Amino acid sequence: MSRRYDSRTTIFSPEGRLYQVEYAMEAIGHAGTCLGILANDGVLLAAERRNIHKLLDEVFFSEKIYKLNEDMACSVAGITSDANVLTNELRLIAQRYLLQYQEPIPCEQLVTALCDIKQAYTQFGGKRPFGVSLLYIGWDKHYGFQLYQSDPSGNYGGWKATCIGNNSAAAVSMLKQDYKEGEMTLKSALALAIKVLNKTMDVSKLSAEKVEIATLTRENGKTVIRVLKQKEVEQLIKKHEEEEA
Amino acid sequence: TTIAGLVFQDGVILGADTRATNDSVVADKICEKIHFIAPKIYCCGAGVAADAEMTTRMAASNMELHALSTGRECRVATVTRMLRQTLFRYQGYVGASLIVGGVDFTGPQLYSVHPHGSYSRLPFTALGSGQDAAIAVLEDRFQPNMTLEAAQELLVEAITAGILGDLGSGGNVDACVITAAGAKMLRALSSPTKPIERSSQYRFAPGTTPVLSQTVVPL
Amino acid sequence: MEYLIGIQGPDYVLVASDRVAASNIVQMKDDHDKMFKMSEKILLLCVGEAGDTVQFAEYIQKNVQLYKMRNGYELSPTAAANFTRRNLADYLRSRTPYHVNLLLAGYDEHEGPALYYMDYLAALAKAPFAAHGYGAFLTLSILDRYYTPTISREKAVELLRKCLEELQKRFILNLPTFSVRIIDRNGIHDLDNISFP
Amino acid sequence: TTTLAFKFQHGVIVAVDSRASAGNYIATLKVNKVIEINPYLLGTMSGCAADCLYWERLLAKECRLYYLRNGERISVSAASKLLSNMMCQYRGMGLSMGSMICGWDKKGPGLYYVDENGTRLSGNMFSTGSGNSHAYGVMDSGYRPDLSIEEAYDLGRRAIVHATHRDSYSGGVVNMYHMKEDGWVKVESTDVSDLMHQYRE
Amino acid sequence: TTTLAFKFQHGVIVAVDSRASAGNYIATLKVNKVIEINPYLLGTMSGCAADCLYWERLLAKECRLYYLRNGERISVSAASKLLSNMMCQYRGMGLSMGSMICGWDKKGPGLYYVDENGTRLSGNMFSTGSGNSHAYGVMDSGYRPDLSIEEAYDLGRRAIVHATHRDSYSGGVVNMYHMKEDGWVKVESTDVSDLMHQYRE
Amino acid sequence: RFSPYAFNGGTVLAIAGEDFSIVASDTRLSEGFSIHTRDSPKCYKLTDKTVIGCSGFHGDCLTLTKIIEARLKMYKHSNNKAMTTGAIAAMLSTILYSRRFFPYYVYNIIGGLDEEGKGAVYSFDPVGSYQRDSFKAGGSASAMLQPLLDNQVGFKNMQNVEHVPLSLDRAMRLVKDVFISAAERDVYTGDALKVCIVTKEGIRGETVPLRKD
Amino acid sequence: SYDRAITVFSPDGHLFQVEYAQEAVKKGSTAVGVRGKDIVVLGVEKKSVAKLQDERTVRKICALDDNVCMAFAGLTADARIVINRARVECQSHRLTVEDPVTVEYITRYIASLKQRYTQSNGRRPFGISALIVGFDFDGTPRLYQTDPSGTYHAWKANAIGRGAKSVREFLEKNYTDEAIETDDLTIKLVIKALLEVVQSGGKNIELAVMRRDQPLKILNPEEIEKYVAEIE
Amino acid sequence: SFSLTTFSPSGKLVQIEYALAAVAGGAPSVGIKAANGVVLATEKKQKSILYDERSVHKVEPITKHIGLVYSGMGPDYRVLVHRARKLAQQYYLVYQEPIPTAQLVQRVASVMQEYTQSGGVRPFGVSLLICGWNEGRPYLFQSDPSGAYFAWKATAMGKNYVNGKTFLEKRYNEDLELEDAIHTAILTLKESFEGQMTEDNIEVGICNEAGFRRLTPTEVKDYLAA
Amino acid sequence: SIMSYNGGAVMAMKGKNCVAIAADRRFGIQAQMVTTDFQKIFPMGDRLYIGLAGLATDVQTVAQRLKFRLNLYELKEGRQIKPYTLMSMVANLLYEKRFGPYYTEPVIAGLDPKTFKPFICSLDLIGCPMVTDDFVVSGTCTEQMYGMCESLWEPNMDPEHLFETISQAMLNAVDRDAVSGMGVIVHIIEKDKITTRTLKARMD
Q: According to the 3-state scheme, what is the secondary structure of H93-104?
A: HHHCCCCCHHHH
C-beta atoms of H2 and A5 within 8 A: yes
Are I196 and B215 in contact by the 8 Å Cβ rule? The answer is yes
Are D135 and D127 in contact by the 8 Å Cβ rule? The answer is yes
- Maximum Cα interatomic distance, chain E, rounded to a whole number of Å: 55
- Residue H52 in 3-state DSSP? coil
- Residue H107 in 3-state DSSP? helix
Q: Label the pairing between strands E13-16 and E20-22.
A: unpaired
C-beta atoms surrounding E40 within 10 Å:
17
Alpha carbon of C53: minimum distance to chain G alpha carbons (Å): 14
Closest to A102 (Cβ–Cβ): which among C71, C73, C82? C82
Alpha carbon of H32: minimum distance to chain I alpha carbons (Å): 24
- Residue H30 in 3-state DSSP? strand
D43-to-D60, D68, D85, D135 alpha-carbon distances in Å: 9, 20, 17, 18
Search chain D and give the residue with CA nearest I203: D193
Are I193 and I28 in contact by the 8 Å Cβ rule? The answer is no
- G102 phi and psi angles, rounded to 5 deg: -65, 145
Of F135, F87, F113, F124, the closest CA to residue F202 belongs to F113
- Residue G19 in 3-state DSSP? helix
DSSP H7: B
The number of residues in chain D equals 201
- Residue G211 in 3-state DSSP? strand
Report the neighbours of E using a cutoff of 3 or more CB pairs below 8 angstroms: C, G
Sheet strands (E) in chain G: 31-35, 39-44, 61-63, 68-74, 128-135, 141-145, 153-154, 157-160, 206-211, 217-219
Amino acid in position D171: G
Q: How far apart are CA G106 and CA G101, in angstroms?
A: 7
Of G181, G164, G225, G195, the closest CA to residue G29 belongs to G164
Q: H111: exposed, middle or buried (C-beta count within 10 Å: 0-12, 13-18, 19+)?
A: middle
Contacts of A100 in chain C (CB under 8 A): 82-83, 86
Alpha carbon of C124: minimum distance to chain A alpha carbons (Å): 12
Amino acid in position F66: K
Alpha carbon of C86: minimum distance to chain A alpha carbons (Å): 6
C-beta atoms surrounding I76 within 10 Å:
14
Long-range contacts of F84-89 (CB under 8 A, 24+ apart): F84/F49, F84/F50, F84/F114, F84/F115, F85/F49, F85/F50, F85/F110, F85/F111, F85/F112, F85/F113, F85/F114, F85/F120, F85/F122, F86/F114, F86/F120, F86/F122, F86/F132, F88/F46, F88/F50, F88/F52, F89/F120, F89/F122, F89/F124, F89/F130
Of I138, I49, I137, the closest CA to residue I87 belongs to I49
H215-to-H197, H199, H203 alpha-carbon distances in Å: 16, 10, 8
Domain count, chain C: 1
Helices (H), C5-129: 50-71, 77-90
Q: How far apart are CA G145 and CA G208, in angstroms?
A: 18
Contacts of C62 in chain G (CB under 8 A): 91-92, 94-95
C-beta atoms of H2 and G1 within 8 A: no
The number of residues in chain B equals 219
- Which residues, 6+ apart, have CB-to-CB distance to A50 below 8 Å? A32
Active site residue B125: no
C-beta atoms of D27 and F143 within 8 A: no
Are A67 and A123 in contact by the 8 Å Cβ rule? The answer is no
User: Residue I118 belongs to what H/E stretch?
Assistant: strand I118-122
List residues bridging with B21 in a β-sheet: B26
Q: I192: exposed, middle or buried (C-beta count within 10 Å: 0-12, 13-18, 19+)?
A: exposed
Catalytic residue among B1, B55, B56, B160: B1
Domain count, chain H: 1
C-beta atoms surrounding H196 within 10 Å:
6
- Residue B97 in 3-state DSSP? strand
The CA angle F10-F14-F19, to the nearest 5 degrees, is: 160
- Give the method used: cryo-EM
How far is Cα of residue A114 from the mean position of the Cα atoms in its chain?
14
Resolution in A: 4.2
The full 3-state SS of chain E, as one line of letters, equals CEEEEECCCCCCEEEECCCEEECCEEEECCCCCCEECCCCEEECCEECHHHHHHHHHHHHHHHHHHHHHCCCCCCHHHHHHHHHHHHHHCCCCCCCEEEEEEEECCCCEEEEEECCCCCEEECCEEEEECCHHHHHHHHHCCCCCCCCHHHHHHHHHHHHHHHHHCCCCCCCEEEEEECCCCCCEEEEEEEHHHHHHHHCC
Q: How far apart are CA H155 and CA H143, in angstroms?
A: 12
Alpha carbon of I2: minimum distance to chain C alpha carbons (Å): 12
Of G133, G148, G146, the closest CA to residue G67 belongs to G133
Q: How far apart are CA D128 and CA D115, in angstroms?
A: 9
C-beta atoms of D137 and C166 within 8 A: yes
> Do chain I and F touch: 3 or more Cβ pairs under 8 angstroms?
yes
Search chain D and give the residue with CA nearest F133: D30
List residues bridging with I196 in a β-sheet: B215, I187
Q: Is H1 on the interface with G (CB under 8 A)?
A: yes
Q: Which residues of B touch H (CB under 8 A)?
A: 57-58, 60-62, 64-65, 68-69, 71
Q: Give me the sign of the Cα torsion angle I184, I185, I190, I195.
A: positive
DSSP codes, D68-114: HHT-S---HHHHHHHHHHHHHHTTTSS--EEEEEEEE-SS-EEEEEE
C-beta atoms of E81 and G98 within 8 A: yes
Amino acid in position I116: F
Q: How far apart are CA E172 and CA E165, in angstroms?
A: 10
Q: Is H96 on the interface with I (CB under 8 A)?
A: yes
Q: How far apart are CA A102 and CA A95, in angstroms?
A: 9
Are D99 and D46 in contact by the 8 Å Cβ rule? The answer is yes
- Which residues, 6+ apart, have CB-to-CB distance to H167 below 8 Å? H156, H187, H188, H191
Q: How far apart are CA B100 and CA B63, in angstroms?
A: 13
- Which residues, 6+ apart, have CB-to-CB distance to B14 below 8 Å? B3, B4, B5, B34, B42, B43, B44, B99, B101, B175, B176, B178
DSSP G204: G
Q: Give me the sign of the Cα torsion angle D127, D133, D138, D143.
A: positive
- Which residues, 6+ apart, have CB-to-CB distance to B44 below 8 Å? B3, B5, B14, B16, B33, B34, B35, B98, B99
Alpha-carbon Rg for chain D in angstroms: 16
How far is Cα of residue B42 from the mean position of the Cα atoms in its chain?
9
> Do chain C and G touch: 3 or more Cβ pairs under 8 angstroms?
yes
C-beta atoms of E85 and G104 within 8 A: no
Domain count, chain G: 1
Search chain I and give the residue with CA nearest H101: I77
Q: Label the pairing between strands F131-133 and A43-48.
A: unpaired
Q: Is H89 on the interface with B (CB under 8 A)?
A: yes
I160-to-E49, I20, I54, I192 alpha-carbon distances in Å: 78, 11, 30, 15
Closest to D162 (Cβ–Cβ): which among C134, C144, C162? C144
Closest to E70 (Cβ–Cβ): which among G96, G98, G105? G105
The full 3-state SS of F34-54, as one line of letters, equals EEEECCCCCCEEEECCEEEEE
Q: What is the dihedral of CA E34, E37, E40, E42, to 10 degrees?
A: -30
Search chain C and give the residue with CA nearest I26: C125
Are A216 and A42 in contact by the 8 Å Cβ rule? The answer is yes
Search chain A and give the residue with CA nearest I70: A95
Are C7 and C15 in contact by the 8 Å Cβ rule? The answer is yes
- I179 phi and psi angles, rounded to 5 deg: -85, 0
Of D138, D180, D184, the closest CA to residue D8 belongs to D180
C-beta atoms of H89 and B69 within 8 A: no
C-beta atoms of C125 and I55 within 8 A: no
Domain count, chain D: 1
The number of residues in chain I equals 204
Closest to I68 (Cβ–Cβ): which among A61, A70, A95? A95
List residues bridging with A46 in a β-sheet: A35, A213
C-beta atoms surrounding C138 within 10 Å:
26
Closest to H94 (Cβ–Cβ): which among I76, I78, I92? I92
Q: Give me the sign of the Cα torsion angle D95, D101, D105, D108.
A: positive
Closest to D28 (Cβ–Cβ): which among F128, F131, F143? F131
Q: How far apart are CA I66 and CA I56, in angstroms?
A: 15
The number of residues in chain G equals 232
C-beta atoms of C140 and D165 within 8 A: no
Of H27, H34, H4, the closest CA to residue H184 belongs to H34
Domain that holds residue D30: 1-201
Contacts of I73 in chain H (CB under 8 A): none
Q: How far apart are CA B190 and CA I156, in angstroms?
A: 26
DSSP H121: -
- Residue B203 in 3-state DSSP? coil
Contacts of C29 in chain E (CB under 8 A): 121-123
Q: How far apart are CA I195 and CA G51, in angstroms?
A: 48
- CA within 13 Å, CB half, G228: 20
Of B116, B122, B173, the closest CA to residue B2 belongs to B173
- Residue C194 in 3-state DSSP? strand
Alpha carbon of G102: minimum distance to chain E alpha carbons (Å): 10
DSSP G138: G
The full 3-state SS of D103-117, as one line of letters, equals EECCCCEEEEEECCC
Q: How far apart are CA G198 and CA G204, in angstroms?
A: 9
Contacts of G52 in chain A (CB under 8 A): 159-162, 172, 175-176
Of E46, E39, E77, the closest CA to residue E60 belongs to E39
Search chain D and give the residue with CA nearest F129: D50
Domain that holds residue G176: 9-232
Are I180 and I24 in contact by the 8 Å Cβ rule? The answer is yes
How far is Cα of residue A210 from the mean position of the Cα atoms in its chain?
17
Q: How far apart are CA A62 and CA A46, in angstroms?
A: 10
List residues bridging with E36 in a β-sheet: E42
Q: Label the pairing between strands D35-36 and D25-28.
A: unpaired
How far is Cα of residue E21 from the mean position of the Cα atoms in its chain?
18
User: Residue H169 belongs to what H/E stretch?
Assistant: helix H161-171
Closest to G99 (Cβ–Cβ): which among E70, E77, E85? E77
How far is Cα of residue D16 from the mean position of the Cα atoms in its chain?
7
Search chain C and give the residue with CA nearest D201: C148
How far is Cα of residue E51 from the mean position of the Cα atoms in its chain?
15
Alpha carbon of F95: minimum distance to chain B alpha carbons (Å): 31
Search chain C and give the residue with CA nearest I101: C93
Alpha carbon of F141: minimum distance to chain B alpha carbons (Å): 9
Report the neighbours of G using a cutoff of 3 or more CB pairs below 8 angstroms: A, C, E, H
User: Residue H191 belongs to what H/E stretch?
Assistant: helix H178-192
C-beta atoms of H7 and A23 within 8 A: yes
Place domain A2-245 in its CATH homologous superfamily: Aminohydrolase, N-terminal nucleophile (Ntn) domain (3.60.20.10)
Q: Label the pairing between strands C124-126 and D20-22.
A: unpaired
Alpha-carbon Rg for chain E in angstroms: 16
Are A146 and A43 in contact by the 8 Å Cβ rule? The answer is yes
Closest to D162 (Cβ–Cβ): which among C141, C163, C170? C141
DSSP D143: -
C-beta atoms of E77 and G105 within 8 A: no
DSSP codes, F187-203: TTS-S-EEEEEE-SS-E
- Which residues, 6+ apart, have CB-to-CB distance to F10 below 8 Å? F25, F26, F28, F29, F42, F55, F56, F139, F140, F188, F189
Of D17, D46, D32, D36, the closest CA to residue D191 belongs to D17
List residues bridging with D35 in a β-sheet: D43
- CA within 13 Å, CB half, E20: 15
H13-to-A5, E106, G228 alpha-carbon distances in Å: 17, 64, 52
